[PDB]
Write a protein that binds this ligand. Sequence first.
Ligand SMILES: [Mg+2]
Ligand SMILES: [Mg+2]
Ligand SMILES: [Mg+2]
Ligand SMILES: [Mg+2]
Ligand SMILES: [Mg+2]
Ligand SMILES: [Mg+2]
Ligand SMILES: [Mg+2]
Ligand SMILES: [Mg+2]
Ligand SMILES: [Mg+2]
Ligand SMILES: [Mg+2]
Ligand SMILES: [Mg+2]
Ligand SMILES: [Mg+2]
Ligand SMILES: [Mg+2]
Ligand SMILES: [Mg+2]
Ligand SMILES: [Mg+2]
Ligand SMILES: [Mg+2]
Ligand SMILES: [Mg+2]
Ligand SMILES: [Mg+2]
Ligand SMILES: [Mg+2]
Ligand SMILES: [Mg+2]
Ligand SMILES: [Mg+2]
Ligand SMILES: [Mg+2]
Ligand SMILES: [Mg+2]
Ligand SMILES: [Mg+2]
Ligand SMILES: [Mg+2]
Ligand SMILES: [Mg+2]
Ligand SMILES: [Mg+2]
Ligand SMILES: [Mg+2]
Ligand SMILES: [Mg+2]
Ligand SMILES: [Mg+2]
Ligand SMILES: [Mg+2]
Ligand SMILES: [Mg+2]
Ligand SMILES: [Mg+2]
Ligand SMILES: [Mg+2]
Ligand SMILES: [Mg+2]
Ligand SMILES: [Mg+2]
Ligand SMILES: [Mg+2]
Ligand SMILES: [Mg+2]
Ligand SMILES: [Mg+2]
Ligand SMILES: [Mg+2]
Ligand SMILES: [Mg+2]
Ligand SMILES: [Mg+2]
Lengths: 208, 132, 328, 311
Amino acid sequence: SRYGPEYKDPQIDKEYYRKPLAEQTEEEKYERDFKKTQLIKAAPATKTSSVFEDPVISKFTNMMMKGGNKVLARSLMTQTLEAVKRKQFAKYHAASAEEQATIERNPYTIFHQALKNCEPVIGLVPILKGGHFYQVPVPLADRRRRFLAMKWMIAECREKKHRRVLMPEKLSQELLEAFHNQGPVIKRKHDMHKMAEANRALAHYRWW
Amino acid sequence: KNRAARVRVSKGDKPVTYEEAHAPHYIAHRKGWLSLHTGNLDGEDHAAERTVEDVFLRKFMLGTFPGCLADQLVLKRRANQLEICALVLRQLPPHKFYFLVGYSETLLSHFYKCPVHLHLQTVPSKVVYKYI
Amino acid sequence: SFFTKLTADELWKGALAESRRKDLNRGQIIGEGRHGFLWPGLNIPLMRNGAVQTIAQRSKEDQEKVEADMVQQREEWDRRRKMKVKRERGWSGNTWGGVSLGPPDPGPNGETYDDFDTRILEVRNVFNMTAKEGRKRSVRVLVAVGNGKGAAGFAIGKATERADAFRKAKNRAVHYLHYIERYEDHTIYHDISLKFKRTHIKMKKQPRGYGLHCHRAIMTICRLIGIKDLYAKVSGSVNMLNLTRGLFLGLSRQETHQQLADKKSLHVVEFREECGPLPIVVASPQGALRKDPEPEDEVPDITLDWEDVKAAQGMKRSVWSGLKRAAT
Amino acid sequence: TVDFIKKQIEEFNIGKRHLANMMGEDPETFTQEDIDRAIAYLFPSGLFEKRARPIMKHPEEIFPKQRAIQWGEDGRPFHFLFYTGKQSYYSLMHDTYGKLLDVEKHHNPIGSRWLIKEELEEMLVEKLSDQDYAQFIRLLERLSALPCGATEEDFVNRFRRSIPXXXXXXXXXXXXXXXXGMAFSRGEGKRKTAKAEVVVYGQGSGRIDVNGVDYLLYFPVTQDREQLMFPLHFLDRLGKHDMTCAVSGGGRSAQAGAVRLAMARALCSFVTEDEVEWMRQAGLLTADPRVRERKKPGQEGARRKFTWKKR
RNA sequence: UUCGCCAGAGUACUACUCGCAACUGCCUAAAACUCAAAGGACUUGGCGGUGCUUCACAUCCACCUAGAGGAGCCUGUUCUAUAAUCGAUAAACCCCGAUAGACCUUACCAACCCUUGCCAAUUCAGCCUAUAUACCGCCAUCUUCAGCAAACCCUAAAAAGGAACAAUAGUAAGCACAAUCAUAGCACAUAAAAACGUUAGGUCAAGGUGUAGCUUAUGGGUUGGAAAGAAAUGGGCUACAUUUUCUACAUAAGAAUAUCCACCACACGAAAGUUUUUAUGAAACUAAAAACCAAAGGAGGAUUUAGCAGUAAAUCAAGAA
Ligand SMILES: [Mg+2]
Ligand SMILES: [Mg+2]
Ligand SMILES: [Mg+2]
Ligand SMILES: [Mg+2]
Ligand SMILES: [Mg+2]
Ligand SMILES: [Mg+2]
Ligand SMILES: [Mg+2]
Ligand SMILES: [Mg+2]
Ligand SMILES: [Mg+2]
Ligand SMILES: [Mg+2]
Ligand SMILES: [Mg+2]
Ligand SMILES: [Mg+2]
Ligand SMILES: [Mg+2]
Ligand SMILES: [Mg+2]
Ligand SMILES: [Mg+2]
Ligand SMILES: [Mg+2]
Ligand SMILES: [Mg+2]
Ligand SMILES: [Mg+2]
Ligand SMILES: [Mg+2]
Ligand SMILES: [Mg+2]
Ligand SMILES: [Mg+2]
Ligand SMILES: [Mg+2]
Ligand SMILES: [Mg+2]
Ligand SMILES: [Mg+2]
Ligand SMILES: [Mg+2]
Ligand SMILES: [Mg+2]
Ligand SMILES: [Mg+2]
Ligand SMILES: [Mg+2]
Ligand SMILES: [Mg+2]
Ligand SMILES: [Mg+2]
Ligand SMILES: [Mg+2]
Ligand SMILES: [Mg+2]
Ligand SMILES: [Mg+2]
Ligand SMILES: [Mg+2]
Ligand SMILES: [Mg+2]
Ligand SMILES: [Mg+2]
Ligand SMILES: [Mg+2]
Ligand SMILES: [Mg+2]
Ligand SMILES: [Mg+2]
Ligand SMILES: [Mg+2]
Ligand SMILES: [Mg+2]
Ligand SMILES: [Mg+2]
């Protein structure tokens, strides 16, 4: 907010800048962009042009940080990706050739998958009518859903571990079980879905 | 509502001195300081004395020069001597003015044990900054 | 404790308490003192026959005398503050009705009226409802002005401070003047019966010895117009404003002898009782005097006011009517 | 008030001489530029508002313009539109409309703007209303809408103004060192209590030195090294350049960011004129305006307040 | 032109009469007594669990984060107790006047004492005594709200109102907002500012005063003594542990880790206490540090507080007295 409304966001992707020549409306557009003498924001410190940056991992990284510890959250995440990695190597070498073709060794694909699979389709909002609060079925916008998945994973592997158990480990377990849909996280997604199905009549109430 | 050193808006007829028309938040922005001395700078001593001293010279000049004082009284301290400037209204016949000049300078000089210099600038009527 | 004390003004603010003022700046000269020193530049001129008088001290008794002088000064000022109560009364006591407000203000064009008297007809405290303040108090005065020579008018004015409002009505009232046509420069021309908004005005044209018998307001207005002889009774609501509006409409409603003559093209002839049958002409029809006599009905058809006819036969028995009252 | 202007301009010149002779300059070439220096040295007011500082100026800049005498000594007014109460406005209007009419009988993005409302108010020496201004400008659009004559164009030029626009990241010419005969560029970034300076040598081993130690050791936090990597990975120069670095103030992330700015600044000598606008749109060369906000008294954290109690 | 109806308001579509297929009925219809009014229409406000539009940007809802209510402790009120201050006490009190009480401060209680008893002079001093609903001072509050207000002008009358921009009666300098200043260049942000009034809001204990009271005392001194907890509650601090605890250390380490079991107890948590020192000081009741001890607490009912970005949250250091 030390930025006036005059300052537009930085677009940080390099592939965009290096290879413009085949795109007309985008050539027009970024021409408008810098030609407008557009005051543009100092790019954040978390966003980098690193080839290794996955925005989803960043968000999930943040939401795990208590206080101001980037260092610590970064480390816990790193250890989670790592933990899943090694756990999947262990599953690989102890398996049969068919399953060697099957198994996912990429902790990243495992992560985007275990989140795609944990995200609820519909969710509830309370509506006040005639004195009572009814929980009613609301279709959700994607970002809210992503958030719900991540929030759930973090809250689940935060709360229910036995104290001798480190975060990255349990988190890895929950990731791999949510991968196969058998994990408690998905039990949660399902209790959402069931609660929505029971109240489906009340989907009349919602006016928007 | 800040009441500090302020002069309220009247029916609009009230005469106001440039100083009394500029509210406390304005010091060092438009208004200046009524006194000057070294004492409040970073490394400096005896600020308090020049404050008591100043106060007493406000009361003193208001009392020695009745009804003839125009605007608040401007003190300067330079290398141990006081330079006291006053805006003074013309009421008195000039003899009395010089009587009180000598009277003041002498009396003060012997009170504060440092040489005092006095200046009267005479004005026909209180300057009006606003309203009127 | 010299440090604890303050300026005079502050003390008077916090004495008076507006959230009478006496001044201590009055009577004391420079160098004036109780220990009685005569200072060469202040108490005494700087020089005598011999130059440069020295610093001198008066006697015990010379000081007792100067002190007596200041004491008698204060006494004089207190008496002068108490003697400040004097007034001329308008109608009754604290009623501002009929009070002389003093000639209106000279306009922008140098136009000056020293000839115009003003009288306050009605001063009234009026209130309003302001979200901020609760009640809000205005004063409204209805004021009339006239030179005695037949032109006069009135206006209303309203302000928070009543003084302000007296002023306002003055000036606004010079802006509305009527010319009021007087017969032989005292009465009205003919009787006027005029109903105006719930108030009835009725006025009979008197002969000369009969000064101004009227509602107190209408007396006031008729002294400002210069009408010296009138009978006027008022019916219905007496409220001041409707009354003066009514009266002014009515006295401008007047049909003059010249105009009567002109529309009827005949001579108009005053028959005095004191002068017997002598057929005094008042007005002549400039242009052609008609050769035509006018119908004399045994039976005229006119609105007749029951009050006048009741008067006529001796049927007004009210003990209030025939009263002696003070001069006009 | 005109007698005041005559008098004041006279005394202004007499005081002008008086100023020059004491200040000891030739009274002839004395300018306003010199007037300022003069008073500023004679009556040195530290004061923040600059209008309340001492002024000696030509009365015309001191005083407001005046509306001239509007009627002869007979009472009779000069301008025929006088009774409109704005003659100044409606004269412009009459003329404008006349111009238009004549154009209709005859006819059979440079950075130029119309006046502000305040500028038309200055031009006519007349208070204005928004509506009025709007009306007029509307009319000038009608004027531009048709075939444009010579005097037509001059006319609308009166109400024309021109504005500057400047955008380029200022390009430092490189600097070739005498010792190796080699070219370098020295940048300065500043972020949030932390300033950094970065000298970049155009022929590198990839070496990056910070305060006399290696960059890995000075930024054990990986995140920081990534921030550092940003400009170089952007311009694909990662091994090509050799940087020396001096940074001070603040904590680690602040430092890594200052080095980001300084480096990305020192990298625009060795880059192409085109990649510059990219680094702008990447937001590399723009400072971070974000800083700590002072606690406020009676509060907690500049924003955080003491817990509020309804009862 | 006629007829019928009205002489303050209640009392009273009532009490008594008269007449009626009514017999808690209809019709006709008073007075005692009480009051200085009772009524109609309007005017600005304010208000509305009326209707309609448009918003809320820490903000009501939905949403995000971190907490309060539970525990220990700190500290403030409220009550009980005391011979033993005052003031604040819905939003706008409650780590508040205090950026600060061992003596002092100090106004309090307990005893003793002194009477032109600070000053140049005064049948004069001195009063933290009663009035904040007499006040000036300083502020709170609506409020980051846009209005306040003189001077005029208009309204088949004016209590009051006064705009429509292809404009229909409004003009107006002033004070507000805005603008500029400060946060060392811009910009935004924050700071500041924010009238008129409102709450008889706060304060006669900062000081000063109007009115009242005290004058061998409601004045002035010396010596001690107060500030105990059955509770009840406001705000904080530290926790409840693995995103943790310890040591090294600055941000890659090594160990500990609530249950074994008879540990020779340990995991988190002692800010609390008991002991010893030390700092200050004439006087330790005060602060700090070690040694011991290790308790409640295992994430907290109804309900609530705060925050829109370098903010919230966490961490560290400095100053005022
Ligand atoms: Mg404020
Ligand atoms: Mg009387
Ligand atoms: Mg904070
Ligand atoms: Mg009756
Ligand atoms: Mg009935
Ligand atoms: Mg009956
Ligand atoms: Mg009958
Ligand atoms: Mg909130
Ligand atoms: Mg709100
Ligand atoms: Mg809690
Ligand atoms: Mg608690
Ligand atoms: Mg108390
Ligand atoms: Mg008690
Ligand atoms: Mg109390
Ligand atoms: Mg009170
Ligand atoms: Mg209060
Ligand atoms: Mg607090
Ligand atoms: Mg004590
Ligand atoms: Mg006492
Ligand atoms: Mg009381
Ligand atoms: Mg009050
Ligand atoms: Mg007050
Ligand atoms: Mg406005
Ligand atoms: Mg008005
Ligand atoms: Mg600036
Ligand atoms: Mg701003
Ligand atoms: Mg503020
Ligand atoms: Mg402002
Ligand atoms: Mg009160
Ligand atoms: Mg209250
Ligand atoms: Mg007092
Ligand atoms: Mg007193
Ligand atoms: Mg005593
Ligand atoms: Mg004591
Ligand atoms: Mg409790
Ligand atoms: Mg806490
Ligand atoms: Mg370790
Ligand atoms: Mg302890
Ligand atoms: Mg223990
Ligand atoms: Mg336990
Ligand atoms: Mg709530
Ligand atoms: Mg100190």
